[PDB]
Structure formats: C-alpha cells, structure tokens
Design a binder for this molecule. Sequence first.
Ligand code: NI
Ligand code: NI
Ligand SMILES: [Zn+2]
Length: 359
Amino acid sequence: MERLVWDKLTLLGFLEKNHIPQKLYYNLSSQDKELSAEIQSNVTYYTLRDANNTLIQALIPISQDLQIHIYKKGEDYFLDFIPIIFTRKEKTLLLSLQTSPYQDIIKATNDPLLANQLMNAYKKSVPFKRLVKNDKIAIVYTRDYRVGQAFGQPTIKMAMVSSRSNQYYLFSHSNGHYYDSKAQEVAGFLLETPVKYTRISSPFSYGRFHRPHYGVDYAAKHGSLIHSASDGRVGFMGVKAGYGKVVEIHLNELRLVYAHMSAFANGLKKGSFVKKGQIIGRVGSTGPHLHFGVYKNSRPINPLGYIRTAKSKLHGKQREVFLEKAQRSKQKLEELLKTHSFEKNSFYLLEGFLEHHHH
Ligand code: NI
Ligand code: NI
Ligand SMILES: [Zn+2]
C-alpha cells in the first residue's frame, strides 16, 4: 500500500475526492459518524489503488488502536472500524544535562514529542525548573510501530530527574494517568463537568474485547450552556462532519473537544484564551447532547477520570502491583546508571529496560 500523510480532508471529502459513494458516510449511525470525525491532520494512512488508479482500499487511523477500513468488494464499497495491528518497542534514555532538558532530549532522540511529554509531565515540578548542568534525566518509554514505522506518540512508562542528589520519579499506569512513587497522582488536571446534564447517554469506551466511544455524551436540553472544563487555548472552532459545531481547546498535553453545539459564545475564536468555567457555547444536536472528549498526548482518555476535586491515588490490588513494579523499576534504573558512565558520554539511548544488561 502507499503510505501517505493526511492533510485537511474530512472522511466525506476523502470519499468525494476518490469517487466513492457518499452514502457510505451518510448511512453511518450517529455513533459511527462521531467516530469518523476524529481523523487527525498529519496522521499517516494507507491506500491501495488498481491499474485504473481507482481507490480499492484505505486504512485511516482514528486513534492509536482503531482505524477506518474502506474497501471495494464486488461492485460496492464498505466501511469498517477495525483494530490497528502494531509492534511496541521500549527504550531507556539516560541523560546528564549539558544544555537544557529540552535540547538534550532532542539531541539524544531527535523526538520533540517525547521532549514535550516530559516538559508537560514535570510542568509544576519545582526541582525540574531548577535542573542544572550534570543533573540526571532518565525516561523509560515505548513507541508503537506499523510495518517498521513509528506512529502516534510515545508513552512514558517511567521518568526520573535528579536535583541536589534527590530523585523525582513518575510512572504511568494503564489508566493513562501519572503517579508518583507513593502511588499518588502527579501532573494531573482537575476538570469540571462542562454542562448541566440530565443523564450520561453514552460513556467513554475503548470498545475492547472481554462499541468504541471516544468521549462522554451528556444528554442535555437544547440551548443548555456549555462551560470550558479547563483553562486553555482554542485550537479549532467550526463545523466537523459527525460533530456538527465543535470547539477544541488545548492545555499542556490535553486537547478537549466540545461537540454538537447549537452556537458558539460571542467573540470566541481560534486562538482565544479561555478560563475554566467560561461559557463557550450552547448544546445542540448538529435528542440534544454535548459530546465531551479529552485527548492526552493525542490519545483519547476517559474524561470522567479527571473530573474530581482532589488528586487521585491508587488503591487495593492496583496499588500493591504498582508499588511492586515501581520498586523494581527504581532498582533497575540505579543499576543502569551504575553501568553507563557519563564520563564516556552525555547520554545513552538503550534498548529495553528491565531486560537490559551486559555480558
Ligand atoms: Ni547497556
Ligand atoms: Ni544475559
Ligand atoms: Zn459522543
């Protein structure tokens, strides 16, 4: 297949451009239409054409693990939402600061995405802002690959920065949030419910085997006020097929989506800075509901996990398992730092983490 980069088309625009009957979109359920609205610009997608240059297949990612599959069978086109098959690689970055955290990470990885994730993860960290030459930064992270090619964003499993001989750790969890070594949340966001809803008509779902919905649908009256769940900056504001009128707001590594609006607030525009609690529009059905979506580092995440008044902590068996892994991870990081000298090199980018050792 040809590997290409998505630019500005909608699904419908893509169908039109390639002479695929547009009913393939119009016939979708409203849930599938919402799903189809999340094709991001710059995603890598795949196409296959026949001798006539007719589009006979396409694979278009809508998340890190779901994609649209369009294919011609006999005389007709079909559209499925299917899993993405991928390979995951783990690396360990070990770094002695030479210039700035950001520049050094780029030097060692050539990856702005990872560098931005670290800055964001430590955004409120006082020791982080006070890092100086020869302070240490370690990151254990994974990246996902499709036929050899990385896609989406990396995932930080563990990070550590040292300042004045003290080490400041954070760890990911399968729930998508970061935790310190006492299993309490760090680098969180306190989001507020953005509308007065009558009920949640459809919660967030990965749709995973034991259905995918990448937001929360809040049933509300047409015209109900919609308030920003957070501070941030408006990125997009307008109409997207499947979402109707929508506002997107960015804050650190979050993108927050508010869809199906009947109207935007007067004077709101692309680039507007907004405050948590500020009115950004009104509920519509462009019956009525607000679709509220949250994306961390490009990946959809359950918004409800961040609507809380306090910082989260892990509990029960989740806490036990976490702390066990955290201890093992900390011990292993020390061993790796002992066995890779910053006299020889300012950084090391190592294959794997727990299994990494020499002979
Ligand atoms: Ni090594
Ligand atoms: Ni061995
Ligand atoms: Zn929805």
